[PDB]
Amino acid sequence: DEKAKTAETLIWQLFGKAMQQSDPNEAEKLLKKAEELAKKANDPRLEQVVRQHQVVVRFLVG
Amino acid sequence: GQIQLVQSGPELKKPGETVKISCKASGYAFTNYGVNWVKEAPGKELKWMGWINIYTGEPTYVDDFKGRFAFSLETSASTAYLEINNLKNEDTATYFCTRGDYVNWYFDVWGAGTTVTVSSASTKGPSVFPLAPSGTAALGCLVKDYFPEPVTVSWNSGALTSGVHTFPAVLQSSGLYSLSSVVTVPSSSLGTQTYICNVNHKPSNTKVDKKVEPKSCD
Amino acid sequence: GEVKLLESGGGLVQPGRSLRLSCIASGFDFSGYWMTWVRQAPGKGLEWIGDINPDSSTINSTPSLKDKVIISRDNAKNTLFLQMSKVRSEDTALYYCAQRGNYVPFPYWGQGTLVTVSAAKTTPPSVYPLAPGSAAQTNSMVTLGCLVKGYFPEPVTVTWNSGSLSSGVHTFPAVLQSDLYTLSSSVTVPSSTWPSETVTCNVAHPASSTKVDKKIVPRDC
Amino acid sequence: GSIVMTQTPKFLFVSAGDRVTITCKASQSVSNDVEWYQQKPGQSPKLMIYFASKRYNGVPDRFTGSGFGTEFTFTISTVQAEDLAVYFCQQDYSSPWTFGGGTKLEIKRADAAPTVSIFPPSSEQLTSGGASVVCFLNNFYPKDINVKWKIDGSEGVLNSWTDQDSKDSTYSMSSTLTLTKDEYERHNSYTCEATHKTSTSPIVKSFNRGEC
Amino acid sequence: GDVVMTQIPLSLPVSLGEQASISCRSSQSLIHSNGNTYLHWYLQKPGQSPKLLMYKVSNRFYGVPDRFSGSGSGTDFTLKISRVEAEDLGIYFCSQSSHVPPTFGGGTKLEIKRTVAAPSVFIFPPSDEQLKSGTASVVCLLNNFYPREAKVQWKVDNALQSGNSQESVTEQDSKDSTYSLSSTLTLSKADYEKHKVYACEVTHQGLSSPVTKSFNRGEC
Ligand SMILES: CC(=O)[C@H]1CC[C@H]2[C@@H]3CCC4=CC(=O)CC[C@]4(C)[C@H]3CC[C@]12C
């Protein structure tokens, strides 16, 4: 699915942007946007990836 | 292309020096994983050394590996460097650079491993002595006091291969190596067949052909 | 082909002498496996004697028999030898040679040979016919027999018509009395087959090297 | 000291189709180096189980082996007629290698009456000076049986029993009466009498020397 | 501190065509907060880098044959191989990632199983060339035995030696699966010439009694 791949690329880009951020609120907003994009893609795997990214970002940045 | 990591060749150092090992990644997007380092000591367990994140370059070390070790990156060339300062005799080990994932947290792609050996002994050639025989009799050659590894032992220029045992080398107290090569032959052929052991040590450019005879008890 | 182990050298030996048994192996690479001698007392459990390695460098033997036996092998003729000195009455037994392999323990066994240590003297067997009486011919099946009496030592082999008749043959264990053995062997055949067809019992005694063929004949009444 | 292997039970009386279990117990740890052998009456031992769980080539699937440490078990799920034998357990963990005592397996069946036949001494044995009167009792069960010799009605007797047959599981018995030629010729009537569980009256087989 | 992983057993002899089982036990709970249990199994062959076999307890990594299975929970985990082959020999070890930092187990080695066999013992004296240099090495060789456990002792005039002998062991043979061992005793020239009788004593499980191979200095 091309749409799924594009959504995955966008999710990874958002995760990369969040990883190099200093304000945890900005990272939370980016992760919320990524979760919304994953929900729009209708793929459980993308939701799982977003959930894991949230955990990793919250641990490392927070 | 095939996803792989390439590491530099083996390293031989003296105490007090500094070494630098490289790890080059090819076959994937270098900025979507993490680079972990693993150290394996002889006869011990694998030990996680630390990891470096590509996004920001900030490294993380365990407590035991702080101070003397350093991680660095060259993103344009897709390379990771490990730098060791103030070497000791306890740092002789094999180092792997491996790729770590962000979703399942495993190490799925491993490098070949770079061996680092630290010792103050200097290059020296081997000495070959005959373990002489005295319906099946065993004989051989003893290789003593050579540094560093490895040496190659052959019988009759490779003509004899059945029953030949070549034991792994062991480090002596003085810092040099030794080993033994043995072979079993029928007793009736001892006085007819000429047995020669050939020992080759490339770092010292030493090649020795030793003839083994039954001990002249007469 | 099929793995074959064939023993030889057994029989009667007077006490205090020496004994030499041989075992020939065929069907496999004789110079690659360990070789074992095992023995069994009559009516008892097995007992392990010893074994030897391919090049005769290491020999294992039971501690109680370490000083009495000597094992050797010859890969030129595919042969294994056992030698015993000063045998006693306690060594009367049956001996097997077995292969001891790398991945399977004791997979192939020989037939085994009988060793009897006694001071008696060899005596050839006496074979007698056993024909049914006139009143025993009223059944569809009729029994005949051969009686082997007064032989020494064991064993004797009794067959009927050179092994052609294998069904309906009972061979009872021998009884020992006054240093002589006695046994009887019976065969049951359809009444329409005898005396129309010839029935002959063959008795072989290797110890006395005596072979006797005795035809079953109706009683001369 | 030598490792002592104790095997139980010593005797087994089972009917066809049942399941049996034999236990071999060591005096000290022998890891998993135990082999189970089967020996039929009058033949060489045959390897059945090795390394305590593995099955040798050609062995029917109804034989299983298990255990570890100091106890091992050998199990037959469905006993057939041709499984009558003696079974041994052996360890080769440490020299010297010791065998167990062995379990002797026996088969039950329905009771059967014996077939009785009598044979007077042959002419050649009479010529030799002796006289052997033979009594054959074929195909009965169970083994317990009484044999009586009657010379002219009046009560040198050797008794031999065969091993249990592996096809129909019956026992056969040979009774031999040994006498001198003169003693045999001094009497006419000779009777073999069988008393067995299958009947309340003895089976009588009689002959007369004058008769032939 | 760091989670401690203990693996059972240290050496596992198995035969081709059968099943094998390996146990890994942690020092504490490996269940992560989010719900997943991160226990991984790796395999390493001689002379190569480790390769992932199983991830997250029971999942199977891409390319792994179907005969590998994993199970367990809490602090007890198990790996099972239904039908061992010649290519499955190596060192297996577990790892965790649920608590910083990841740790690795000690490793279980798989090897072929065969029957017991006693060693052949030989003894080699020192040559004259070495004696002219001031040192003397005496060698005791044990040939073609199984299993790996054997004990060697050096006796000089019936006095047990300690702290100057070194041993070396080969790998399992590729044709009949046996080992070989070499024990070297090093002496100075004066100490070598102070004594007469030298002996190597071997104790092995497959031998009913210890085997002594001895010689005398200067004799033949
Ligand atoms: C991407 C990568 O290399 C992985 C391999 C091991 C992983 C770590 C394992 C331990 C861990 C547990 C957490 O709950 C937070 C994230 C961390 C700290 C992980 C971060 C990502 C790592 C470093």
- Same domain, yes or no, for C28 and C51? yes
* Residue C107, in any domain of the structure: yes
* Residue C137, in any domain of the structure: yes
- Same domain, yes or no, for C42 and C102? yes
Nearest to D96 by CA among B148, C119, A29, C48: C48
- CB contact under 8 Å between E169 and B130, yes or no, is no
d(CA E214, CA E157): 10
Q: CB of E206 within 8 Å of any CB in chain C? A: yes
Other CB atoms closer than 10 Å to residue B90's CB: what's the count?
8
d(CA B197, CA B195): 7
Contact D128, C126 (CB under 8 A): yes
Q: Looking at ligand 1, which residue's alpha carbon is closest to its atom 11?
A: E100
- Same domain, yes or no, for B145 and B113? no
* Residue C193, in any domain of the structure: yes
- Same domain, yes or no, for C175 and C107? no
Last residue of a domain, one of C97, C117, C137: C117
Q: Which residues contact C50 (CB under 8 A, 6 or more apart)?
A: C36, C37, C59, C60, C61, C62, C65, C69, C71
CATH 2.60.40.10 applies to domain E120-216: yes
Last residue of a domain, one of C117, C137, C159: C117
D116 forms beta bridges with: D137
The token pair that represents C199 in the structure block = 């029935």
Enter the DSSP assignment of E130.
H
Partner residue opposite C134 with nearest CB, options D119, D158, D211 = D211
The token pair that represents C8 in the structure block = 């030889």
Q: CB of D162 within 8 Å of any CB in chain C? A: yes
Please state the length of chain C: 221
Parallel, antiparallel or unpaired: strands C46-52 and E179-188: unpaired
Name every chain C residue with its beta carbon within 8 A of the beta carbon of B137: none
* Residue C60, in any domain of the structure: yes
Query: Checking phi first, is residue D188 left (phi over 0); if not, alpha (psi -120 to 50) or beta?
Result: alpha
D204 forms beta bridges with: D193
Answer whether B55 contacts ligand 1 (Cβ < 6 A): no
> How far is CA B151 from each of CA B134, B138, B166, E46, rounded to the nearest angstrom?
27, 22, 11, 20
- Same domain, yes or no, for B37 and B107? yes
Q: Write down which chains contact chain C via at least 3 CB pairs under 8 A.
A: B, D, E
- Closest Cα in chain D, distance from residue E206 (Å): 5
Give me the domain span that covers residue B204.
127-212
Last residue of a domain, one of C117, C140, C159: C117
CATH number of the domain enclosing B191: 2.60.40.10
* Residue C220, in any domain of the structure: no
Instruction: Please tell me whether residue B189 adopts helix, strand or coil conformation.
Output: helix
- Listed resolution, Å: 3.3
Answer whether E100 contacts ligand 1 (Cβ < 6 A): yes
- Closest Cα in chain B, distance from residue E184 (Å): 10
The token pair that represents B76 in the structure block = 């344009």
Please state the length of chain B: 218
Answer whether A59 contacts ligand 1 (Cβ < 6 A): yes
Answer whether B34 contacts ligand 1 (Cβ < 6 A): yes
Residues 100-159 of D with CB under 8 A from C: 100-102, 117-125, 128, 130, 132, 134, 136, 138, 158
Name every chain B residue with its beta carbon within 8 A of the beta carbon of C55: 135-136
The token pair that represents D146 in the structure block = 């009484």
Give the start-to-end residue ranges of the domains of chain E. Answer: 6-112, 120-216
Q: Could you tell which of E39, E100, E103, E104 is best to mutate to test the pocket of ligand 1, judged by most ligand atoms within 8 Å of the CB?
A: E100
Q: CB of E117 within 8 Å of any CB in chain C? A: yes
- Same domain, yes or no, for B20 and B37? yes
Answer whether B125 contacts ligand 1 (Cβ < 6 A): no
- Same domain, yes or no, for B65 and B31? yes
What does CATH list as the number for E6-112?
2.60.40.10
CATH number of the domain enclosing C46: 2.60.40.10
- CA angle (B118, B120, B122) in 5-degree steps: 110
Give me the domain span that covers residue C138.
126-215
d(CA B7, CA B94): 12
Ordered domains of chain D (ranges, CATH): 5-107 (2.60.40.10), 115-208 (2.60.40.10)
Contact C27, C2 (CB under 8 A): yes
